[PDB]
Structure 1
Amino acid sequence: STTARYDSIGGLFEDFTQSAAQRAIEVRTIFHMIGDVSGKSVLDLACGFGFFGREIYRRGAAKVVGVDISEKMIELAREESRKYGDPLEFHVRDVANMEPLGQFDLVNAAWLFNYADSVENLRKMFKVVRASLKPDGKLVAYTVDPDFSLAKGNFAKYGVNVLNERAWGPGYRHDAEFVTDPPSQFSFYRWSRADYESAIADAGFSHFEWQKPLLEADDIATHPPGFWDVFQNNCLQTGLVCKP
């Protein structure tokens, strides 16, 4: 038996997704990158309780498979599929160490790569994703912006309190907590843009593109003036699409 970090977070992550200001921007940006899923087979990596895979199934995907390292999160994911009677299937795997489970039209990986604890493990994850993709498929990912700096402002008001920033091999490691009750602590890794693009190339993707989060006028209208300045000038998050 082996502990995963989210085994102690569990239901609090869903609490975070319902209150954090940044979540609506993440969801909007991710589905903008995904586009139409009708008929597609989908692999949702670091699936948590299964949000993205389940919404992708709700938008008309064919087969949807979810993978997460946390037995606790997979247990919550399976209970949601049981409650809504949907066909999602889930597996407990460490993505840096797993075998491919099939060839998919779409791999969705929201908040996977920032949990690679070395550039070596980053590279392994991308290789695994490439081995899971049909030749005309694509990877849609959401991860930490390599250029985020804690000196330029915390993200706590958007839902993620970043507690510190430490050099960690060629990148950085951050301790943090989701703004929940009580707050739920976790750690994540900020690898450089160069290491990401090298991991993508060496895994056999010919195309990648970074995607700035889709913050919109209606988001700005409904918060006090300047609320989104740190989000715009020191963004913690970024989108990423890769194609074989």
Structure 2
Amino acid sequence: GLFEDFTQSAAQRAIEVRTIFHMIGDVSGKSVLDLACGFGFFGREIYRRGAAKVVGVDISEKMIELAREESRKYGDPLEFHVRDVANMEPLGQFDLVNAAWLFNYADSVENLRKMFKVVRASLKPDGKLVAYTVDPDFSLAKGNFAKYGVNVLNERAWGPGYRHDAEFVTDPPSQFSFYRWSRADYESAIADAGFSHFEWQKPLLEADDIATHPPGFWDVFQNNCLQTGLVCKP
């Protein structure tokens, strides 16, 4: 119902969700910490798919308030917390940490490295991190993402990474500003946090995605993707 409807309302969201659940795998019985949980609706789908416990964290008070009200209305058992994730103490030892659109909101590599250490401090030794973030290789000169609902307005060298302002296709227009840290700096953060295993995951563009759009539609998505998945394990 709701999760399908929202996931299909944007061509790229369907690819995002499919890629994140590919990385996650079977979540039956697992404890999950969703570190940039928004209003909780991804966490509610993880719960629906069989997770034993789902805890969501976000920076925004007013959004966590709204997340808790949604769980009361649905009767689901999700637990929420407001935290500045880069500086939070552990909430528990989870089988899975999910971090969609967390790491690109680290506004310095110092904060990026802190976030990865927070993830490790929240994971069982046989747990894993599944993340969705900006592909380090995206370059605005190679193509904007407006076909896919994100009008990237600029690209500013920002210390060792780049900062981007973007317009989303919302009514009214809305602004998001995010960071594109390098693959080197991600992998350094990963290793220094104690993840001896990682893999980058290309978004799973599939045959049906291509059939429902005109010729050339996904070219920039493939040649200059803005997004990437990432899986890390101790």
TM over 0.5: yes
Band of TM-score, shorter chain: over 0.9
RMSD, aligned CA: 2.3
Compare 220-229 and 67-76 and name the one that shifted more: 67-76
Which structure 1 segments of 5+ residues have no match? 1-10
Structure-2 residue corresponding to 1:160: 150
Deviation of 1:16 after TM superposition, in Å, equals 8.5
> Which is worse superposed, 64-73 or 119-128?
64-73
Decide whether the 8 Å contact of 2:7 with 2:17 is kept in 1: no
* 1:121/1:162 CA distance change after superposition, 3 Å: same
Worse overlay, 16-25 or 59-68 = 16-25
SS where residue 200 of structure 1 aligns?
A: helix
Q: Is the 8 A contact 2:58 2:84 kept in 1?
A: yes
Deviations 1:85-130 (CA, angstroms, capped at 9, x unpaired): 1000100001111001000000000110000000000000000000
**CA distance 1:15–1:189, shift in 2 (3 Å):** farther
Kindly state the Cα deviation for residue 79 of structure 1 after the two structures are TM-superposed.
Answer: 2.0
Separation in 2 of the partners of 1:100 and 1:212? 30
Say how many residue pairs are matched: 234
Gaps of 5+ in 2: none
Please report how far the alpha carbon of residue 186 of structure 1 lies from its aligned counterpart in structure 2 after TM superposition: 1.2
Work out whether residues 3 and 41 of structure 2, in 8 Å CA contact, stay in contact via their aligned partners in 1.
no
Indicate conservation of the 8 Å contact 1:150/1:162, yes or no.
yes
Q: C-alpha displacement at 1:201, in angstroms?
A: 0.1
Return the offset for 1:159: 1.5
Percent identity over paired residues: 100
Do the aligned partners of 1:175 and 1:187 also contact (CA within 8 Å) in 2? yes
Q: Deviations over 1:183-229 (max 9, x none)?
A: 11010000000000000000000100000000001000000111000
SS in 1 for 2:85: coil
- SS of the aligned residue for 2:86 comes to coil
* TM-score, normalisation: structure 1: 0.92
Task: Decide whether the 8 Å contact of 2:37 with 2:57 is kept in 1.
Answer: yes
Deviation at 1:77, TM superposition (A): 1.4
